[PDB]
């Protein structure tokens, strides 16, 4: 019954994670866009002192999102939000009930956060080499159940954590967004279309087919355009090794 | 009833996290040391193909830890193990039951993983300037309840996640172990003793005072000696400016 407000930005895969979980939960919630990278509102540190999106408020009196209440609980960090939503909506079964299957979900989130996410960041924003990213994606792909299904079998918050990044990769590569070289762009497009990565392509299709994805995605072209607003995705700059 | 085996190493704060949680759970478990950085056994990739410590097996038939069974569940990534132990031992209350307090625990773990750990790595392994690490520690300190307590109030897995790293800082600094210069060592020791960091000193004392720490710590001197076996700590080496 307590209000949920999610401070969002279309380009932000971290915020996307939390929109997906809130859709899967059947939650009632409000979103409020924040131009966090170009023009942060002066009140935004009241909802997240770290000055990052996503930010969440929970409970407190019903107020406009640009007039946040000191009485709402302020929740930071997208993965903590995913676990919070699973805790708030247990009947939505956003995690398995079996401990080992739950661990598969947590391990998958950690594999992504610790070994893949930084490689996406460094390849796209710094133009570091693509091979370590592809190796990390092959590792992540190896953690999926072979025959189909999601990270822990049934869909869970682990798939909300990972699909925003994987789903952006394909249209961003096709639009040439990112500071990596032409050569590495070709390499990544060929690899991600190759048999080596058939399983993760299935995984991406499977997650994208769910309403929680459709209802939280602007469309491939619209997401590309939002991404071009990110300052670190400087058009015309590339790094080479 | 299902067996737990933790593959560990004394120097490793990641493994330490899981020992602390297992002690707090009152779990029955085996530990088995692995010389992962200098002489990894040929069988170790059977328990963790990532070739990292900690690794955990769960269930399967009882076998010697150097003859792991293909039948046990293989669990990777320390924070996934912490959540697993909390799931296995619900009566030990290793997380709060209140969703907002649980989220404080998850957020604190994410703050550490995302903003603090990499600064510890930069300073200790590369000898980069200490100010960004002290800034990150002040941020992490800021997330604690100011008047006392653990990260989420009552002790939780969040404090298992963080104390191994903070507890190593003071004795490693006293030994001058790490790639930072004497000048930055002095600066860090002074800062960590100053009133700026009184709250995190209280937190370290409060965590260290629990049996789960005492029973999983070799002693400061002994831990320093184990850390000197770590190749990336480059005992006797320091970078300057
Ligand atoms: N670890 C954070 C990362 C969030 C993050 O980095 N958000 C970006 C937008 S995609 C941001 O707000 N950056 C602003 C800044 O770092 O100052 C999470 O998981 O929520
Ligand atoms: N993300 C891992 C980090 C584990 C880790 O880095 N362990 C170190 C020892 S402190 C290791 O085994 N390193 C060997 C390697 O990276 O190849 C976790 O949370 O468990």
User: Cβ A110–B58 below 8 Å, yes or no?
Assistant: no
B51 lines ligand 2 (CB under 6 A): yes
Q: Does A112 touch chain B (CB under 8 A)?
A: no
Tell me, in angstroms, the distance from the centre of ligand 1 to residue A181's CA.
25
Which residue stretches of chain B are H helix? 13-25, 44-47, 78-88, 99-111, 117-121, 131-142, 157-174, 182-193, 198-208, 211-214, 220-228
CB contact under 8 A, B102 and A109: no
Is residue A229 lining ligand 2, measured as CB closer than 6 Å? no
Phi (first) and psi of residue B234, to 5 degrees: 50, 60
| Residue A54 alpha carbon to ligand 1 centre in Å | 7
Q: Do B93 and B165 lie in a common domain?
A: no
Q: Are residues B93 and B105 in the same domain?
A: no
From the list B6, B9, B46, the residue with the least C-alpha distance to B23 is B6
Q: Given CA atoms B124, B126, B127, B132 in this order, what sign does their dihedral have?
A: negative
Q: What is the DSSP letter of B63?
A: -
For chain A, percent helix, then strand, then coil, each to nearest 5?
55, 10, 40
Answer yes or no: do A75 and B100 touch at CB < 8 A. Answer: yes
- Joined together, the tokens standing for residue B77 give 């990534």
Distance in Å, CA B14 to ligand 2 centroid: 7
Which residues of chain A are within 8 Å of residue B88 when distances are taken between CB atoms? 99
Residues A26 and A5 in one domain: yes
Bridge partners of residue B75, in order along the sequence: B56
Residues within a 6 A CB radius of ligand 1: A 12, 14, 36, 51-54, 77-79; B 114
H or E stretch at A58: strand A55-58
Q: Which two tokens stand for residue A230?
A: 């990110």
Q: Are residues A83 and A110 in the same domain?
A: no
**Distance from the A84 Cα atom to the nearest Cα atom in chain B, whole angstroms:** 6
One domain, residues A66 and A115:
no
**Is there a contact between B76 and A139 if contact means CB atoms under 8 Å apart?**
no
Method: X-ray
Beta bridge partners of B105: none
From B50, B83, B139, residue closest to A106, measured CB to CB: B83
Question: In terms of domains, do B65 and B131 share one?
Answer: no
Provide φ and ψ at B201, rounded to 5°.
Answer: -65, -40
Ligand 2 neighbourhood includes B227 CB (under 6 angstroms): no
Domain ranges, residue A150: 98-241
Distance CA B229, CA B89 (A): 34
d(C-alpha A72, C-alpha A79), whole Å = 19
- Answer yes or no: are the C-beta atoms of A56 and A85 closer than 8 Å: no
B81 upstream amide cis, omega within 30 of 0 = no
In whole angstroms, what is the distance from residue A109 CA to residue A111 CA?
Answer: 6
What long-range pairs does B49-54 form, CB within 8 A, spacing at least 24?
A: B49/A142, B50/A139, B50/B76, B52/B14, B52/B76, B53/B7, B53/B8, B53/B9, B53/B12, B53/B14, B53/B15, B54/B6, B54/B7, B54/B8, B54/B12, B54/B14, B54/B15, B54/B17, B54/B18, B54/B78, B54/B81
Find the closest chain A residue to B142 by CA distance: A49
CA of B53 to the centre of ligand 2 (A): 5
For the stretch A43-47, contacts whose Cβ atoms lie closer than 8 Å and that sit 24 or more positions apart, written own/partner, are A43/A67, A43/A68, A44/A7, A46/A70, A46/A74, A47/A7, A47/A74
Closest partner residue to A80 (CB to CB) among B50, B58, B106 is B106
| A112 plus A227 within the same structural domain | yes
Pairing of strands A4-8, A30-33: parallel
Shared domain for B118 and B231, answered yes or no, is: yes
- The answer to whether B140 faces chain A, any CB pair under 8 Å, is no
Q: Are residues A145 and A89 in the same domain?
A: no
Helix axes B78-88, B157-174, angle to 10 degrees: 140
Q: Give the number of domains in chain A.
A: 2
Domain match, B139 and B93 both: no
B132 lies in the same domain as B22: no
Minimal CA–CA distance to A164: which of A16, A9, A3, A1?
Answer: A16
Q: Which of B65, B97, B129 is the last residue of a domain?
A: B97
Q: Which residue of B has its CA nearest to A107?
A: B80
Decide: A194 in ligand 2 pocket, CB within 6 A: no
Phi, psi values for residue B139, rounded to 5°: -60, -45
Rounded distance between C-alpha atoms, residue A74 and residue A115, angstroms: 28
Choosing from A53, A81, A97, the residue where a domain stops is A97
By CA distance, what is B109's nearest residue in A?
A80
For chain B, the residue count is: 241
Among residues B68, B97, B126, the one where a domain terminates is: B97
Closest approach of chain B CAs to the CA of A168, in angstroms?
Answer: 21
The residue nearest atom 14 of ligand 1, judged by CA position, is A52
How far, in Å, are B46, B52, B86, B198 from residue B6 at the CA level?
14, 12, 15, 34
List CB contacts (< 8 A) between A109 and chain B: 80
A200 and A123 in a common domain: yes
């Amino acid at each position: 019954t307590k209000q949920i407000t999610l401070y969002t930005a279309t380009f932000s895969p971290y915020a996307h994670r939390v929109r997906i979980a809130l859709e899967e939960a059947g939650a009632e919630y409000t979103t409020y866009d924040v131009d966090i990278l170009r023009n942060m509102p002066d009140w935004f540190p009241l909802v997240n002192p770290l000055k990052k999106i996503p930010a969440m408020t929970f409970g407190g009196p019903e107020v406009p999102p640009d007039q946040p209440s000191p009485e709402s609980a302020k929740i930071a960090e997208s993965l903590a939000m995913l676990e919070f939503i699973a805790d708030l909506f247990p009947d939505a079964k956003l995690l398995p009930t079996d401990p080992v299957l739950r661990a598969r979900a947590r391990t998958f989130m950690a594999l992504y956060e610790n070994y893949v996410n930084g490689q996406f960041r460094d390849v796209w924003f710094l133009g570091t080499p693509a091979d370590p990213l592809l190796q990390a994606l092959e590792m992540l792909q190896g953690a999926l159940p072979p025959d189909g299904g999601f990270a822990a079998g049934e869909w869970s918050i682990a798939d909300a954590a990972v699909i925003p990044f994987l789903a952006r990769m394909f249209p961003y590569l096709e639009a040439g967004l990112g500071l990596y070289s032409k050569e590495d762009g070709v390499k990544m497009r060929k690899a991600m279309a190759s048999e080596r990565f058939a399983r993760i392509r299935q995984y991406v299709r499977d997650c994208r087919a769910r309403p929680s994805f459709a209802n939280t995605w602007a469309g491939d072209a619209e997401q590309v355009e939002a991404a071009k607003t990110v300052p670190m995705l400087r058009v015309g700059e590339h790094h080479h090794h």
